[PDB]
Design a protein around this ligand. Structure first.
Ligand SMILES: Cc1cc2nc3c(=O)[nH]c(=O)nc-3n(C[C@H](O)[C@H](O)[C@H](O)COP(=O)(O)OP(=O)(O)OC[C@H]3O[C@@H](n4cnc5c(N)ncnc54)[C@H](O)[C@@H]3O)c2cc1C
Ligand SMILES: Nc1nc2c(c(=O)[nH]1)N[C@H]1C(S)=C(S)[C@@H](COP(=O)(O)O)O[C@H]1N2
Ligand SMILES: Nc1nc2[nH]cnc2c(=O)[nH]1
Ligand code: MOS
Ligand code: MOS
Ligand code: FES
Ligand code: FES
Ligand code: FES
Ligand code: FES
Lengths: 334, 756, 164, 151, 51, 164
């Protein structure tokens, strides 16, 4: 149909040059910028201090990094935010830090950057340390185009708090640590069920901004899986997605900790805490599989008229995903 | 002579460079305004007020248009049963009520959003079942019947009856609907640049709304970024509104729809419900078939009738059935009016056919390919509508596909896989198709061309067809070049326009190559006849010499050409007369692997053998087969439109409506064009290819169904001959729910339940 | 008093003295700069018809970086000191086609053509980061680009020639 | 298909009323009111290789071309006239359309028997001649050189 | 049949109203530019330079 | 710093906030306001193709006065608080023609039509000053309007109907 032998060869040294004038401007120190529109004032914050001052002066000011969510809210939900602050330039919001407990990403780090860093960590570190990382990576597979992942921030996905976020269930199940700041405040909390109190809301004060996110190393006797539904039918509900973690007593099959967190089963990310609490000190066997499935079927039960429908399918996925986790943990145990 | 050569699409390089101009890429006039439609948020309601007070405060706001502003007629649509702008009552979510005009598209958007409508709800009918229960239909029952059904069912060893549903489909042309209208300010003259397959109806509908003669309206179509039938009629929703804005303001006006608007307003493929009963022998031979078809037509007729006719013409697929009755009813519902979509009712009827055929094989406990083969038409058989199948190439396609796909060896590997795997299963299916070639309405089978040869010998060809990616202009240039015996470099097609070729049929029914090819050919013959005396006097001279000599002897170098497809005219009263000119044929074998725990699946391998006659351009035709197949893949396995109980579309963009992606296609994807099968009935022995291959995407669906059957054998029960209902699309939800096991039943929780 | 917004498009400096925070890159390219090769297909990040390449000197990484973005969602106000490359920035039929453009066209990877600039820019971006990509990297570079016409096979076949 | 007619020919309008005359010709030839006929413009993609609008011959030559095209239309419509004799133009046009008869045609005219030779002083240089006579009266001012055109 | 009748020029009413469009009356595109010819001020000469 | 220039065109208020002293009324009408009925024929006052009517309150005469002017030579900066009437201000085929427009058309006074708006405005201005002019006043009304097509006879004959 065509003849590749006749194609012009690629000469990668002959590509359009990066604008030399733009390169000369890299020396110019960053300063706060203000843009004024018909309806919106936009402040480009150059420093963390500037961000915290602005947020103290205008708590209602909306943060925008990648705009991959805000652009949707403004265009399709007719939301208007008269003041926007873009913190993308701020070094602290972009830092990738390797620590004793895990890998920290500034909240403005693009998902592409998260993916690259985590892929490197998985390639170099022992399997037993990278269980949570691998879960994040699985959720980032078949997630969005390279275009989206290059500008979509990690923090943006978290704080968007969509019921069907593929990342929040993994962060919740793993107790991923969130460092949160405002003028005169700084606190770090592991993500848990309390972090999402209601639809599209998080447990942040009106002034508070998410600074950094520490994704933990997995420990000995600790295993993780993440799964997600392969269809999406509503804008922000009814797509099952999950993170699952078990910690055993040293060298055993006896449950010490268990966390099963799901999106797409309610109007926020939730944890099947009643179900998992019942399994503490139990052994990883057929009885546990039965009891967990019984618990999930009850705890995450959906009304026939639940928003999003696909009621049977969603229930079946909650159990089927746990089944996959159950078998995977058995393979990892031995 | 490039006919039969894989010439790339003439505009491909400009498309790759971003130089090809689509409607909205045309520069704006200094004074050009923008229109945004204002549509209903209710399925069925009286309009009690429209409040534009907030819209008027938006910077750049110009005006709000409604029915009262129309100078001519507010009655529109193919069957004159629509409004341009709804006046008293809305009859679907997305029903156009009016439009905002503003100085920028951003401003038009802003203004339209704050237009407030007050409604009084009326009882709505959304579902096909809703419509049947309420006797809500357009027109009367359509029917084709042959033989003696009572006798056939008496002779049958086995009878299977059931119900089946196939969901609709959004066109998702990458370029949405758009029109620019330029009012000239003299005599009602208006010139429109439109993304449409139907310049003629665009022209006539604009003229009717304005109340001016059709000769005042000029419609121009350079190209569409996809059409797929969705621009055969429904483009006029945008065109007529933009024309009104141009008329009213005296400014140029344009509108391009955002995706969410387009999916809501413009209609899609018709959902179908079928109730069917098939009688057959223990051998799998069919002796009786009764199928009642119901389409969900939405809130106007549009092309719904002819779509159902095509459905009825295809309920046989490739199978001889001596006793047969097919009926069809068009459901009148409070949804956006459904329209043409590649296949035009064919894929739905063909899917229904393959579903009961799949059930015959299962019931008989026989290999599906054997039952299909046994029931296949032979050369010279009559269809259920009494048309003779001449040049019936399905057996050749079937045999070649079986061989090249290594079907039998792979069948054994699929079985081996299923023996060795508990929670994943493979499936493999081979399916034939035939697709009738011609508009079901005889008068649409006409085509015009206009050719000019300029004094430098360069040739400008105009024809009634439009380019929407299918390579029609490319093929026409190849045809003209062969016909005139000059290089393709000497020929050009610029656009499609109502002032060069009038009264054109829409570019549809897969027939454009056939009918415009003939018209172009005839125009070329006329030119050759006129040049012949000059060639005779100067036989070693050039084309350019002959052209100049003709010019200087005052011989006209401009001619029309015209073609009228012969011997067409089916009668539902006599069940006789040709419905089609000929049929296009093909066969596809697909293999899948399903995840029985999640409902996800992989498309492992697809092999296609398509009879496109002697191809004018194998590259373009293979492209048509692949693209059509993948759209069919989408229809049957990925694409799902979803509505609220109140009838409001939820799935309004790519985040919630999943068309096939790069990673969706079969890992091994093989297409072959059948060799040595010239078609005497069309231009240079070629065949129509546009729509015929789409149904072959169902091979993926029936492979999935095969896999589900293996899963049910593994975990559900012990009944080998069990029939279970699998509607289309076979989404992860439907696949997963069908793999009945300890999870679906909750038996894993300790409860008793309906698995083994 | 507003600051000037300064960015580059296809090597040319753009000085926007009155940037509106609501303005998308796609709107700016098409309706201010008159560069219509970049298309609108959805406005919601799923179709990639609006794909462009962005380049900047990353002051935190100490290097020039290149990546793709959806112009339909990128606020121009995020682009201070960023360089945009569109389909018209890499080649044209009036000058010379870029290899990416030549190969998609010659391989029958363009039918209606509406998705072609976005796909070109996705492939272009890949090559700018990795001039020697694997088949696997190429086959995985287009999750954000939809084509309704081609069934994708020819696009991948044409682009696989860049691999190994 | 509404019966409205769009005429294109090689001649241009510069104030001389050529389009007016062509509409009058088409109306007479087709036997329909002038209101049903329209000329919008002159364009190279409708009528190619046109001579310039010049030599005073435009009415003569485009009139013939328009006439011929109209005769072709009439011939094609005739069967439908005979099927619906008390019908209207609009009815006949729609019937023709629905019977897949083309409602588009070219017309062409080549002025016969022209070809003067300077090397034989023979052959018609012109098709015919236009003739006229004028009588004018003036009054001059012999002292200024100004004058009145009296009659 | 109006042949031989004094029918006014078809465009006369629009010419009287200023609605008849002549070339320069056509609206300008947003990006439309304007040309002015540069011509010789000499009857016959060599062009030495253009500044 | 600059003052606002305020005038009227066909009864509509024009507020020019940045008037250039060099800008002619003809250029402003055609290229700012998009009123193209008024034509350019010479730019030097001899042809009248650009004729408009101007109206203003006279302090001395204590009345509203109406007179014709060549738009090609009228600086817009002379027009503060003046009302302009162009050919489109008096009638249209979309609404109703003014008697002046109807009569010149039906009398065969328009051939190519390019001079017609200017002649219409000259006659219109006369009638606004004198509703029943003499035959003598009518001919004298057009020393500033040139027509290349008609030979003038029909224009005068058409307008004579306004006399007596
Ligand atoms: C086409 C496409 C496909 C997608 N697919 C998926 C998917 O499959 N699964 C999934 O989980 N997600 C998906 N996403 C969602 C995507 O991950 C988020 O939109 C993105 O991460 C948001 O980041 P952003 O920088 O663009 O946020 P923005 O739109 O700029 O802001 C988002 C929200 O976060 C707030 N915010 C941002 N930064 C901070 C901060 N540091 N502190 C406090 N608040 C902050 C903003 O105020 C706003 O409320 C998809 C998005 C697109 C467009
Ligand atoms: N690229 C492309 N191929 C396409 C379409 C399209 O919009 N784009 N439309 C299809 C449909 S619905 C029809 S009917 C035929 C119409 O063109 P043809 O008659 O020239 O085949 O093209 C088919 N193939
Ligand atoms: N696309 C299409 N349109 C039609 N209109 C009438 N018949 C047909 C048909 O068969 N196909
Ligand atoms: O016949 Mo194609 O336009 S559905
Ligand atoms: O022959 Mo007239 O154009 S001088
Ligand atoms: S236009 Fe579809 S992703 Fe931007
Ligand atoms: S070529 Fe048409 S959408 Fe890709
Ligand atoms: S243009 Fe000739 S007088 Fe003004
Ligand atoms: S009508 Fe032509 S200049 Fe007067």
């Amino acid at each position: 149909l065509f003849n590749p032998e006749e194609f012009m060869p690629l000469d990668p040294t002959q590509e359009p040059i990066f604008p030399p004038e733009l390169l000369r401007l890299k020396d110019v120190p960053p300063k706060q910028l203000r843009f004024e529109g018909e309806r919106v004032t936009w402040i480009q914050a150059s420093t963390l201090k500037e961000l915290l001052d602005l947020k103290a002066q205008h708590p209602e000011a909306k943060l925008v990094v990648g705009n991959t969510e805000i652009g949707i809210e403004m265009k399709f939900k007719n939301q208007l935010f008269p003041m926007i602050i873009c913190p993308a330039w701020i070094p602290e919001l972009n830092a990738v830090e390797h620590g004793p407990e895990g890998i920290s990403f500034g909240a403005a780090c693009a998902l592409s950057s998260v993916e690259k860093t985590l892929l490197e960590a998985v390639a170099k570190l022992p399997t037993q340390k990278t269980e949570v990382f691998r879960g994040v990576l699985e959720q980032l597979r078949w997630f969005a185009g390279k275009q989206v992942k290059s500008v979509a921030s990690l923090g943006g996905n978290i704080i968007t708090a969509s019921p069907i976020s593929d990342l929040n269930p993994v962060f919740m199940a793993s107790g991923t640590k969130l460092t949160i700041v405002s003028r005169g405040t700084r606190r770090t909390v592991p993500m848990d069920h309390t972090f999402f109190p209601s639809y599209r809301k998080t447990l942040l004060g009106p002034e508070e901004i998410l600074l950094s996110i520490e994704i933990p190393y997995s420990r000995e006797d600790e295993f993780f899986s993440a799964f997600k539904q392969a269809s999406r039918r509503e804008d922000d509900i009814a797509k099952v997605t999950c993170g699952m973690r078990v910690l055993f007593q040293p060298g055993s099959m006896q449950v010490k900790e268990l966390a099963l967190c799901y999106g797409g089963m309610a109007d926020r990310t939730i944890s099947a805490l009643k179900t998992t609490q019942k399994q503490l000190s139990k052994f990883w066997n057929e009885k546990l599989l039965q009891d967990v499935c019984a618990g999930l079927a009850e705890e995450l039960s959906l009304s026939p008229d639940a928003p999003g429908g696909m009621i049977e399918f969603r229930r079946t996925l909650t159990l089927s995903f746990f089944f996959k986790f159950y078998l995977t943990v058995l393979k990892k145990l031995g | 002579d490039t006919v039969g050569r894989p010439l790339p699409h003439l505009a491909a390089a400009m498309q790759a460079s971003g130089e090809a101009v689509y409607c909205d890429d045309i520069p704006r006039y200094e004074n050009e305004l923008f229109l945004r439609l204002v549509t209903s948020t209710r399925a069925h309601a009286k309009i009690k007020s429209i409040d534009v007070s907030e819209a008027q405060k938006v910077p750049g706001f110009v005006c709000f248009l409604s029915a009262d502003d129309i100078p001519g007629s507010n009655e529109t649509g193919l069957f004159n049963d629509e409004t341009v702008f709804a006046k008293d009552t809305v009859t679907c979510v997305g029903h156009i009520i009016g439009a905002v005009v503003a100085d920028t598209p951003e401003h038009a958007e802003r203004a339209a959003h704050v237009v407030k409508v007050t409604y009084e709800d009326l009882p709505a009918i959304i579902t096909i079942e809703d419509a049947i229960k309420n006797n809500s239909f357009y027109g009367s029952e359509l029917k084709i019947e042959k033989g003696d059904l009572k006798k056939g069912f008496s002779e049958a060893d086995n009878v299977v009856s059931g119900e089946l549903y196939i969901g609709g489909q959004d066109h998702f042309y990458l370029e949405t609907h758009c029109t620019i209208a330029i009012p000239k300010g003299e005599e009602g003259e208006m010139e429109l640049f439109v993304s449409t397959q139907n310049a003629m109806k665009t022209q006539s509908f604009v003229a009717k709304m304005l109340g001016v003669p059709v000769n005042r309206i000029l419609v121009r179509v350079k190209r569409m970024g996809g059409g797929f039938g969705g621009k055969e009629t429904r483009s006029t929703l945008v065109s007529v509104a933009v024309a009104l804005a141009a008329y009213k303001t005296g400014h140029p006006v344009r509108c391009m729809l955002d995706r969410n608007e387009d999916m809501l307003i413009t209609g899609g493929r018709h959902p179908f419900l079928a109730r069917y009963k098939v009688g057959f022998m223990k051998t799998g031979t069919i002796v009786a078939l009764e199928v009642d078809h119901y389409s969900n037509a939405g809130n106007s007729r549009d092309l719904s009738h002819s779509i159902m006719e095509r459905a009825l013409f295809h309920m046989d697929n490739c199978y001889k059935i001596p006793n047969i009755r097919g009926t069809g009813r068009l459901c009148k519902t409070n949804l956006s009016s459904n329209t043409a979509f590649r296949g035009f009712g064919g894929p739905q009827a063909l899917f229904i056919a393959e579903n009961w055929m799949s059930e015959v094989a299962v019931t008989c406990g026989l290999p599906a390919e054997e039952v299909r083969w046994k029931n296949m038409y032979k050369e010279g058989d009559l269809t259920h509508f009494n048309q003779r199948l001449e040049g019936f190439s399905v057996p050749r396609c079937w045999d070649e596909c079986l061989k090249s796909s290594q079907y039998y060896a792979r069948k054994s590997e699929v079985d081996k896989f299923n023996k060795e795997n508990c929670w994943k299963k493979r499936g493999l299916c081979i399916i034939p198709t035939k697709f009738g070639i011609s508009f079901t309405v005889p008068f649409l089978n006409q085509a015009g061309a206009l050719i000019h040869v300029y004094t430098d010998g360069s040739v400008l060809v105009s024809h009634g067809g439009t380019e929407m990616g299918q390579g029609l202009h490319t093929k026409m240039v190849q045809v003209a070049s062969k016909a005139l015996k000059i290089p393709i470099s000497k020929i050009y097609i610029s656009e499609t326009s109502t002032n060069t070729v009038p009264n054109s049929s829409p570019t549809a029914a897969s027939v454009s190559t056939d009918i415009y090819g003939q018209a172009v050919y005839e125009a070329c013959q006329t030119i050759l006849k006129r040049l012949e005396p000059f060639k005779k006097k100067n036989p070693d001279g050039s084309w350019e010499d002959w052209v100049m000599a003709a010019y200087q002897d005052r011989v006209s170098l401009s001619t029309t050409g015209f073609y009228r497809t012969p011997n067409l005219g089916y009668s539902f009263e006599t069940n006789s007369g040709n419905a089609f000119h000929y049929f296009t044929y093909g066969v596809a074998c697909s293999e899948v692997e399903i995840d029985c725990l999640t409902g996800d699946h992989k498309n492992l391998r697809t092999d296609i053998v398509m009879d496109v006659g002697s191809s004018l351009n194998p590259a373009i035709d293979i492209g048509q087969v692949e693209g059509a197949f993948v759209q069919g893949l989408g229809l049957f396995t990925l694409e799902e439109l979803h509505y609220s109980p109140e009838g409001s579309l939820h799935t309004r963009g790519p985040s919630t409506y999943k068309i096939p992606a790069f990673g969706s296609i079969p890992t091994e994807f093989r297409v072959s064009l059948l060799r040595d099968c010239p078609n005497k009935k069309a231009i240079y022995a070629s065949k129509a290819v546009g729509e015929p291959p789409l149904f072959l995407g169902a091979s993926v669906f029936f492979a999935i169904k095969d896999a589900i059957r293996a899963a049910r054998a593994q975990h559900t029960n012990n009944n080998t001959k069990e029939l279970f209902r699998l509607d289309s699309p076979a989404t992860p939800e439907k696949i997963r729910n069908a793999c009945v096991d300890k999870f679906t039943t909750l038996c894993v929780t300790g409860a008793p339940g309906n698995c083994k | 008093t507003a600051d000037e917004l300064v960015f580059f498009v296809n090597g040319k400096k753009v000085v926007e003295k009155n940037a509106d925070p609501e303005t998308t890159l796609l709107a700016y390219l098409r309706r201010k700069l008159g560069l219509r090769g970049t298309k609108l297909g959805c406005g919601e990040g799923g179709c990639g018809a609006c794909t462009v390449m962005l380049s900047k000197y990353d002051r935190l990484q100490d290097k020039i970086i290149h990546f793709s973005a959806n112009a339909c969602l990128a606020p121009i106000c995020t682009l201070h000191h960023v360089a945009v490359t569109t389909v018209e920035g890499i080649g044209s039929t009036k000058t010379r086609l870029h290899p990416v453009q030549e190969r998609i066209a010659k391989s029958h990877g363009s039918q209606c053509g509406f998705c072609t600039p976005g796909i070109v820019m996705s492939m272009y971006t890949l090559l700018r980061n990795q001039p020697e990509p694997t088949v696997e990297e190429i086959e995985d570079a287009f999750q954000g680009n939809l084509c309704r016409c081609t069934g994708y096979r020819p696009i991948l076949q044409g682009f696989r020639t860049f691999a190994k």
